[PDB]
Structure formats: structure tokens, C-alpha cells
Design a protein around this ligand. Sequence first.
Ligand SMILES: [Mg+2]
Ligand SMILES: [Mg+2]
Ligand SMILES: [Mg+2]
Ligand SMILES: [Mg+2]
Ligand SMILES: [Mg+2]
Ligand code: NA
Ligand code: NA
Ligand code: NA
Ligand code: NA
Ligand code: NA
Lengths: 210, 1011
Amino acid sequence: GHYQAEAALLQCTADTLADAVLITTAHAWQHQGKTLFISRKTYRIDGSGQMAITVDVEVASDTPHPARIGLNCQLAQVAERVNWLGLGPQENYPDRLTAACFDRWDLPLSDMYTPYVFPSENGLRCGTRELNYGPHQWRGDFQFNISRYSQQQLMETSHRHLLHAEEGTWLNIDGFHMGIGGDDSWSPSVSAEFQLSAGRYHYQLVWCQK
Amino acid sequence: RRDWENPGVTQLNRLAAHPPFASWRNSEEARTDRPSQQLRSLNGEWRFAWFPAPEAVPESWLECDLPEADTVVVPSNWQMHGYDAPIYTNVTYPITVNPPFVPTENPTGCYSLTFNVDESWLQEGQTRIIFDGVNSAFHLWCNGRWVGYGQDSRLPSEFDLSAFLRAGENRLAVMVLRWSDGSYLEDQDMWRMSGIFRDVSLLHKPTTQISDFHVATRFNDDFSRAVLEAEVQMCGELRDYLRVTVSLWQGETQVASGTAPFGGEIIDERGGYADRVTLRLNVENPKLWSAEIPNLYRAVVELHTADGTLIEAEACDVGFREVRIENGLLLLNGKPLLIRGVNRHEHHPLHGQVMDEQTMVQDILLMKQNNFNAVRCSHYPNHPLWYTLCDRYGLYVVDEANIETHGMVPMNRLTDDPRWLPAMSERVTRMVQRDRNHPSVIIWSLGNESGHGANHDALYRWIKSVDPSRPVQYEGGGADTTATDIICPMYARVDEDQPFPAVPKWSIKKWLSLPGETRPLILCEYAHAMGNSLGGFAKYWQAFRQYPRLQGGFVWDWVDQSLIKYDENGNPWSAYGGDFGDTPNDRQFCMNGLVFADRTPHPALTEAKHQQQFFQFRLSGQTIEVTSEYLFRHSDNELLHWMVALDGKPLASGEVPLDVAPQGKQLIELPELPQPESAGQLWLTVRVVQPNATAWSEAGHISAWQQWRLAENLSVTLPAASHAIPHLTTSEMDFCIELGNKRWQFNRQSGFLSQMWIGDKKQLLTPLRDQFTRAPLDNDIGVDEATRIDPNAWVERWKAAGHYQAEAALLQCTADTLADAVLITTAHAWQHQGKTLFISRKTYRIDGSGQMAITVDVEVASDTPHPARIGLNCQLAQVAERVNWLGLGPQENYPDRLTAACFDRWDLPLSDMYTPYVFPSENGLRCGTRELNYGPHQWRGDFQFNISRYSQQQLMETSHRHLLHAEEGTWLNIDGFHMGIGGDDSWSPSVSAEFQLSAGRYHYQLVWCQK
Ligand SMILES: [Mg+2]
Ligand SMILES: [Mg+2]
Ligand SMILES: [Mg+2]
Ligand SMILES: [Mg+2]
Ligand SMILES: [Mg+2]
Ligand code: NA
Ligand code: NA
Ligand code: NA
Ligand code: NA
Ligand code: NA
């Protein structure tokens, strides 16, 4: 039920600090009465206008290891360039990133999408410390992809030519992403060290305006 | 003539070597291995005097007792009686390297004994004396007359005393030299001692006698038929009426018997051996010998006349087994072995190198109880009883010649020299002559660490020629030379190559498939168990099980070579190299054992037991698949206990009989499990239990276990809204938080929690602070010393980077009030000479329920050596009796040594949370802990911890465990993360990359509350 799981809200609180506002949340993703994942977050918005997001995720040991642990949203903005400090310039994944180099990369948005004839998750860049897109900057230690296509559309579309650019820009920012495998393509081939099996995961991001 | 400085003279007037004799004059006694009247022990009280050199021995001693002599027990090492110091040196010879010469100051032990001989022994036949072990060389006199000379400290020297003895009282005089040309071949990594340290006996044989006998067992293709072949040799007058009968018994049942006069088959142009005969006995459906089922027969060899008068009888235990290498695999009875082995020195903490039956039996029982099936005689032939016990209890033995020349430069200087071939040859040939009838011996070894020389090749071929029944191995010169049937490296790693010039240690998986290579690989030494060690043990066993031609190895090693000393109050303490004034020495390198000298286990022993299990387990749904790794036996003394528990709380249990064929499988379906009525992780534990006692174990012995996570129900229920809210007081010096009876104090200058109160009682003696270091393990230290720094060792990398000296600089310390809690935020930098090593960012959240949640985020500079740990420490004010935790245990476990530990609720006395390694270090960690309870305190999260009365600082500064003093209160170390302990060896970095703290950024969270 990973694709069908619904987020039940466990906690949502707001506190005013000396120089900041703190929002704390907790969600449980459940399927047929089974809790798959728990996500606990804090959002700290300070006087500098920066939003620090801390995320702690619990994954049930008896659920299949998830494809990713991250956040996503559809941004209103469509910008021409994507600028990042991390592994690149090309698409790279945890078990396919040796060729990628750590540097400051700057590509047109279209280059952040890989046009596989059969559409799927694509265009991830790993080991990224800073991402810039229009007025937005995200900082941390994350993997990301960014494109005009939602994960839902990619999942529901059989051929690349049938894809349509959606309104705005879909951003996926992952603390953690599963390996892609490939020893063969007809049996599970992601090696143990690239499966998300740790049970508890932590990541942190800062969102601000540049 | 100074025979002790001449490798051309290794003996004078010594009798031929032979299998164990007793000269029974009753055949029934021979059958049942009862004491023989003709084999007398001369063990007991002897006279002893110590001299600094053989030149200082007075001539009067030859004929008369010295009044200055003492009465001492024999066998003994004279260092153990305090006459001079034992020396612990590893590689460097304890004497100047100047072969074949030894020091002019050569400690000399003068032993004598007055003893009775009955005229019946002298009227007829031959009376010999047998010295089972004299270290390192000796001259022998009897009644003032010189008899002979012997070298090789580890094999029996026998002399004919018939012409020297008279009825009634006789006196032996034995002059034992500490050093001889023999010492050049005896450079094993062990205490250097001397004396008459094995049994002394007197044996009577008739003039017409059995002088040698060899037993062989040959089989058909399926082992359903065997022929026992017994070659018997006589000395004395050949007569046509003489006969040899060989009979074979299984218990009290005679299986076979054959009789023949003397006279062997034609051998060559000159005829045959008139003084030999070979008997051949057919055995149908023989009961086969293995370590799994040590089935033994008894062969009785009778020398007699045709009219039926017995002259004498000899005998041995016979194990029907075939050892062969075929298609690159070592086979026993046609099946490929998996060697669960250990190296074992002959060592006792009080008696030195004197072995007794009780200690030998203790060792064998502990070995078998911990899933060992094999022992290597490192590095010399053992006390004769050892082989009998291995025959009868069932252990595979590597019997190894007493040849080690480690300290030579290059290592093969002597072993490539033909002038040393005679001395080496005697050490090999006399071992084979003595031990070749023991079924437990499955492999011969040419010695240890003597390079590779032409003498090795010659002696390899000699053994192959005289005894085709056993493979020959030898590690010297790169572990895969022409002098070895088995690739037998020491401390080769599983995946990592160590490409040393000339003698590389390849990854064992890689080694097997090098171009042209076909031999099996069994490590002669691996997993160096020095101090807190055996990290990565599971990696070896995974490889052993996956690769057919990786057939296991021998752990280094069984028992710590520590010795007992006594302080000024007369209390015993464990001593190592240098503690006897011995210099140069190699300090604690003599302690490499899975057990302490007194045979108390180190924590590593349980890891060995678990990894060496004979049953393998898989889980699919509710089906447990049990696979037998036995080669010969069915699981006829085994049942499987299973238990399901929710966070340590038992929910269901059962037991199922195991009926698994060797190499077979059994499927066991668990019953429908009741649903847990609360949140948490269900765990399944299985154990194989032996309901019946054996020769080596008690009823209820656990031989195997395994654990799996079952269903987990994550907690989604919020805790009840608290009644009270914590109160913050801000001052210039402190942030103080109050809630009911509880108070927390955060120092604003240091940025740490400096004190807590429950009522009026202070809880801390030392503030709660980050810790990134550990008191170095033996594996962290390696060969690093004060006079010789080894910059590659982990401890030196940590020291040079300033990890132990780094001081915390406060970056941030702030306090906020939330709707239901107080939040303290801190940030510290650890710096050394302008370099920021670590940054710790923390939040402490104290809520109305009294719980303090600590969140820690650590940054580690990528260019600093990866730290030993990332955690917190404090000295608690209280000392409590018990430690209770939910996590891995009960025993000490580390990230690379935790497979044997089980997740459960454990409760131990505080003292059990400290491991008394003789050389003190970080110890007693338990990993994967979700809850810890101590006194009024409870800590929750996902952490590793240790808890004891000794600080890391004290452990770091103390060389011996007996010098440790319990500090006020209790030192707690709670780690989010801890580095591996390593142990592939203990003289180079051995912690594998996956167990190094290299991530750069680390997060952990703890909740501290009242229990
Ligand atoms: Mg000599
Ligand atoms: Mg009698
Ligand atoms: Mg007399
Ligand atoms: Mg050595
Ligand atoms: Mg396990
Ligand atoms: Na698709
Ligand atoms: Na194997
Ligand atoms: Na050693
Ligand atoms: Na059974
Ligand atoms: Na120490």
C-alpha cells in the first residue's frame, strides 16, 4: 500500500520563540490498519526569513524498504536554469554516481529530465549541498530531481511522447533514495547496501529566498 | 665437547622413536588401556640446584647429592619455582643471534633422583628411561656414569639404562641447559622457559620385543568395507616359533584377529625384512571416526610363541577414517571438511608449560561446547595424552614439528642451509614416528615461521613418502609454496589484499583463483583474539560457507599466556611480558586468547561459538528452514526451542524435535501467532538444545541460536497531555529548569548539563559532555610504543590529530519556553591547534512529564581520522547493584562483533558490565539498545552503551587490570555510534571501512527520564 497510503495527522503544534516561530508535526502513513511510516518534523522560521526543516522518519521493519524518503511539492514558478552544488552534471543515483563529480553545476531545466522512452523516476542528482531555482534556495545534504512532470504522470504514462508539461515545476528532495539496480531487469537487483533498511532516518533542509 | 653448540649433534646414545609403548604382559590390560606394571612414573619429588653456567657445576654432583640443592616437584619449569626469570619475546631471539653459539652465561638446572629398581627388571630384558620433555638440551648420568645427550624440547628422549642400574637404590643426574643450538629452532612466540617439564618414566621391555608398529586403514568407494593393515617390527633374536597376533575390538566385541610368523614380503634384490610382519584384517561396515562421532576400535598387538606364551603386548586406539585431497578439496571419509579450528599453546598460569590431564580435558570440553572441531598444535608436538584425548573426544589435529626460526634474517637462513637439515629432519621424523597411529592427527605441519628453505621441500617429501595417509602443510615463505598441500596463510583477510613484497597475503577469496591454483585454503592462523577483538569474525564464516575451497581456519588463539605473580600483600595478579624483569620483551602480545589463562571465557568466545554453529536457519513466512552442516551424523540429540517476544515480553513459545540428516533440511511451520495487544517489535528467537548429556556436554546444552524481526507495529498513540509545565530560571551563570521534585542545571559558560537533582540528591559527579575517543584497544595500538612510534596505528592517528587533547569551545547556549516544555539549544566546537575537529549541535527538551529529550547532530571534519565514537559521557553520583537493558546481550558486543548477541530484556550485576581484560581498554559495550535502566534513571533511544566504575581516562592510563581502582559513582558512556574493534590482526589497522565512522554528519536522539 505504499502508493495508496494516506497521511493521518498525529500532531500539529505552533510555538513562538524569541526570534522564531516553530511548527511541529507528526504523521502516520497507514494502509488497511497497518502503519507503514511515521514522519516527525519541525519547521523553524526565523527573523532572517529562512525556514529550517528537520525530518525524522520511522519505517516499519516488516514493510518492504521504501523507494525514497523525502519531500515533494509543485512549485508555481517555471524558471529557465537549475543551479546546484553537488554531484553532476548528469543524472546520478546512489548506486550509479561514481562518474558524477562534486562541483557547481548550471543547466537548462530540460537537462534535468532524462527522456527514457518508457517514463520512470529520472534525473536525480545526489550529494547536493545547495540547490537554486528561480527565487528559491535549498541547502542541506540531499538528493533531488526537478521537472515539469509529476511522479504520478511518469507512473501513468507508457511513452515519453505522451507526457505533457504540468503547471509549474515538480520538485522532489530526498534525504535518502534507493539504488536503481540493474544486474538484471527481471528480478530484484538492488544490493543490500543501497536498500533503505535502516528503520530510522534523519535529514534536514533550509529553504530560503535568494 | 660443547654438544649444545653443535647442530650436527642433536643426541648421543638416544634410542629410536616409536609410538607410545607400555609393554603389557597381560593382553586384557592392553585391550582396555589399563596401567602397566612395566611402565613406571618417576614424576614427583626430585633434587634440584641452579647454576649460571655448565662450568659452575661441581663434579661431586655426579656421584653425590648437593647439600645446597632443594627438593622440587618434577615435571616443572624452573622459572615457575623462581630460580630465574621467564622471558616473553615474540620474534627477537632471547639470545644474541650467532648460530650455533649460545651465551657463556647459560642457566643450568641440575636435577637428580634417587630411585629403586627391582632385580626382576635387571635379571631379564631392557630397562629404558623416557624423558617426554626437557627444555632445551641435557646430559644424563646414571650412578655417576655418563649415559647420553638429547635436544628437541618437545619430543621424548629415551635411553637404555640396563647396563647402568643395580638392584635397589640408583641415582640419576640430569644437567639441563637453558640455551643450546636447539634454541635456534625454538623461536615460537611464547614464554621462554626451561627444565624437565614433561613426564619422566621407566619402561621395561623384554629382550625380544615389539620395537615399532604402524596401523593403516584403507577403504572401498562407499566406506562400507575396510582393511586394517598393521606392520609390526621386532628387535631381539629371531626364532621360527615367534608369532605376532593383531586383534581388533569394538568395545568388548572382537571384530577381527590375525596371526603370522615374522618375515615380510620381498622388497628388493637382497630379499625382505626378516624382522617384520604385516597383518591385514578385513572389517565389514566399519564404524567411522570423525570429530562428529569419534568411533574407536582397539588394536592389540601381541608378541608371543607358537605354543601360546605371551612375550609382550602393545596397543592403540584405531579410528577408521580416510583423509585425502581431491579436486581441490580436503575430504574426510569422502566429505569436504569445514574446519572450525583454534591454535592452542601448552600454557598454565601457575605451572608454566607443564600440562596436566585436568587442564587438557577442560580445554577440550570448552572447545567442543563452543563449536570447535579442530586444533592446531602451535607450534610443536604436544604432551602425548593430548592426542589420546582428541582421539576419544573427537577433534581434528594438525600435528606440527618443533621448528621455528622467526628471528633469523632472512627467515629462511637456517632452513635453506643443508648443515641444519639433520637437526630439522629429527624434529620432523621423530614426530611422525611417535604420532602416526593417532586417528585425530589428520594433517602434518613442517613447523612455523621459518621462511621457505630447501630443507622444507626435502622433509615435505619424506613425510609424503613414509605416510601417504595425511596431507602435509606449511605456511612459511608465502603460504602457497611447493612444501604445502594446503594454502595455509596467517591473517589473510576476506576481501582485502595485503600485497607485501615476496610474501603477499592475498584476500582468501582471490587467493583460491590465482592463475594455476587448485589447492584448498585453510588459514593456519586468523582472527587474532588479542584483548577486545574478533571484530569481523562473521565475514570469515560467510566466506567459508559460500566458497567450497575455503575450508575454514584456526583462530589465534585458545588461551592467554598470562602468568600469575603476587603483590606485597600476597594477592595474585595476571602478568605479561616485562613483568619479570625480562628485557627486551613484547609486553601484552603473549595474551591473544579466546579464554583467560584460568579458562574463564572472553566475550569473543561466544561470537566464535555462534559463527561456528552446525545448523543454519532461514525464515520464510511462518516456516523455519533448518539445514544441517553435519557431514556424518543425524540430529539425534537435538530439539528446537522457539520463542516470540514483544520488546522482551514473551508472547509464545514451543519446542519441536529436530530430525535432520547430514547436509539435509527440515521445515518447521510455526503455529498461528496471537496478535500483540500493544505497539512494538516482535522478535523470534530459536535455539537448538541437546536434551541428553554427552561425553563433552551436559543435558540442556545450547549448540545453536538465531533471531529474526517479525511484525512491527509502530506506536501512533500520543502521550497524555501533562498536568504541569517546567519552569525556566535564567541567570548569568546558569539556565535552571524545575519540575516537581526534579531540577536540571545548564552551565552557561560551558554549555553543558552540569547537575541534576531528584529531591535533594545530586545526580552527577561530572557534567554530561560529548565524547569522541575511547581508551585504545590492543587493536587500536598495534606495535606502537613510546620508543618506537607507529604513525599508522589508530591510536597514533587519533593522538596526532589531537582527539584526546581537544577542548570544547562554546558557540551557542540559548533557552526558550514552549507551550508545554523548556528548550535548551547548544553548539560546541572541538579544536586542536586552530583546527576544528568536531562540531556538536544539541537541543534538550524538558516537558511536563519530566522527560528530557536530547537531540544531537555532530559534524566531523572529513580530513580528521575517523573518531572512535560519537556519544556522551558523565559520571553518575550513584552506584547501583543491577543494570537492566532492552538491547543486544547479555555479553559485551561491538558493531563488528554483535552477531552472537540477542535482542531481549537483560539484567546483570554491574560487575558483569565490565570485561576484565588483563591489559585495560574500552570494554563492556552493548549495542542496539533501545532502553537502559540504572538506579532511578532510564535512557531510551537507539544507542550503544557501557557502564562501569572506571573512566575511559583511567582505562587509558592503566597497564594492568589489577591496578584499576573503582572511582566514585558510575561512569556512563552512551554512544549514538561506535567504531568497529577489528582483529584480522593486532599489529596493523584492521577495522573494515563499513565499521569506520566516516559519514561526516551524524544524528542521534536520547530520552533521559526517571524509571
Ligand atoms: Mg647440539
Ligand atoms: Mg598386576
Ligand atoms: Mg645398593
Ligand atoms: Mg613467530
Ligand atoms: Mg543473527
Ligand atoms: Na511509466
Ligand atoms: Na567452504
Ligand atoms: Na602473540
Ligand atoms: Na533430534
Ligand atoms: Na590501558
